[PDB]
Each structure stands twice: as structure tokens, then as C-alpha cells.
């Protein structure tokens with residue numbers, strides 16, 4: 001005889017093509033113990049467990065144990081996966097977390113955007129470039145801004161790389177004849193650094 005069901009707090013899970021992700025949901029019951037956590041699409045039934053895409057994974061530690069879902073020490077569900085590079089972008093998936101208390105109460109699924117962040121969350125897939133924000137590097141002084149030579153293009157690409165070590169090693173850095181930088185990430189998405197922040201002349 002428990003009357004309330006476990007409550008969930010999740011978040012805004014933005015994931016990126018080519019990159020791994022890892023988010024956590026916090027679960028608390030009035031009983032202080034939660035015995036089961038399921039993450040699923042709205043389709044199904046009560047015991048449905050279908051979740052798509054298949055690359056979305058979840059895990060929970062310390063299930064079914066007194067006080068593992070208290071306000072002082074919330075139950076935490078790890079939501080993680082690896083987005084493949086061939087995933088469409090424009091794309092988001094609305095999902096549900098269901099938790100179970102010892103008396104059997106299950107989190108109620110409510111199909112409404114007003115629940116996003118709680119037991120309902122959105123997993124938004126974005127392009128790789130949306131994960132990084134390349135930093136303005138060393139200014140590279142060149143002879144002429146309208147005609148960067150090959151070596152000046154290579155020097156600007158090496159300086160951008162030196163300022164941005166977080167950026168995927170496989171990302172390609174190219175510089176044009178007027179000095180604009182193009183960062184092509186592994187999923188072929190693109191970031192571009194203006195020529196006036198990385199290149200200068202004395203004319």
C-alpha cells in the first residue's frame with residue numbers, strides 16, 4: 001500500500017552525430033526505494049519496453065534497495081549511447097521513463113510537452129559541429145590578404161588546430177585563398193571561422 005509512484009527529473013538531452021553522450025535521470029519515491037526503471041517510446045502497453053533508436057541505452061545501479069530513491073540520495077539512471085554518423089538531421093525522439101516502487105506503483109506516462117524534463121524527455125540529434133565552438137587562435141600575419149599562399153593557408157590551419165585540441169582529430173581544417181577557415185567534422189558537418197579573426201596583413 002504505497003499511493004504515490006516514483007517521480008522522475010530528466011533534462012534536455014542533446015546528442016551529436018559522431019559523438020557519445022551520457023545523461024542522468026534522478027528518481028525519487030515516497031517509499032525511498034525504487035525497484036524498476038524502464039525507458040520506452042509512447043507506443044506499447046503497460047508492460048511495453050520498446051525503445052528506439054537502438055543506439056539509445058540506459059542503466060540504473062542500486063535498484064530494489066531501501067533508501068536508494070530518497071531526496072537526499074536520488075536514484076540515478078544513466079542514459080547514454082553513440083550516435084552513428086549516418087543519422088538524419090533536420091530529428092528528435094520523445095521518450096518516457098517509467099519507475100516502479102515496491103507496492104507496484106508505476107510512473108504514469110502523460111503524452112504532453114509540458115512534462116518534458118520530468119519523466120518525459122526529448123533526445124535531439126544534431127550535427128557534429130554543434131558540439132564544438134572553435135576558438136579564435138593566434139593571428140597569422142600574411143603578405144597579402146587577397147592572395148594567401150599555400151604555406152600561409154597551412155599555417156592558419158595549424159594555428160587553428162593548436163587552439164582547438166578538443167576538436168575531433170579526424171576533423172579536416174582547410175583555409176581558402178582569402179583566409180576563411182572551414183572545419184569539416186567526421187559527419188561532414190561544417191564550422192567556419194572568419195578570415196578576419198585568424199589572418200592579418202601589414203598593408
Ligand SMILES: CC(=O)N[C@@H]1[C@@H](O[C@@H]2O[C@@H](C)[C@@H](O)[C@@H](O)[C@@H]2O)[C@H](O[C@@H]2O[C@H](CO)[C@H](O)[C@H](O)[C@H]2O)[C@@H](COS(=O)(=O)O)O[C@H]1O
Nearest residue numbers: 041042043044050092093094095096109110111112113120
Ligand atoms: C494521442 C495519442 O495517444 N496518440 C499517440 C501519438 O501521440 C500523439 O501524437 C503525437 C504526434 C504527438 O502530438 C503526441 O503529443 C500526441 O500525444 C503517438 O505519436 C508519437 O507521440 C510521441 C510522444 O508521445 C511523439 O510526439 C512522437 O513524435 C509521435 O510520433 C502515436 C505514434 O506512436 S505509435 O502508434 O506507436 O507509432 O501513438 C499514438 O498513440
Ligand code: NA
Nearest residue numbers: 041042043094
Ligand atoms: Na512513437
Ligand code: NA
Nearest residue numbers: 129132133191
Ligand atoms: Na561549431
